[PDB]
Amino acid sequence: ETSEERAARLAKMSAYAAQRLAN
Structure with a gap:
């Protein structure tokens, strides 16, 4: 676990x- 991850x-x-999650 690091910041680069x-x-x-x-x-x-x-x-x-x-603008996803619709229709």
């Missing part, structure tokens, strides 16, 4: 579209 969490589960 956090950067990877978003790098792998990144999200550009913040």
Whole structure:
């Protein structure tokens, strides 16, 4: 567990579209 791991969490589960969850 480190700080670098956090950067990877978003790098792998990144999200550009913040308009999901609908329809």
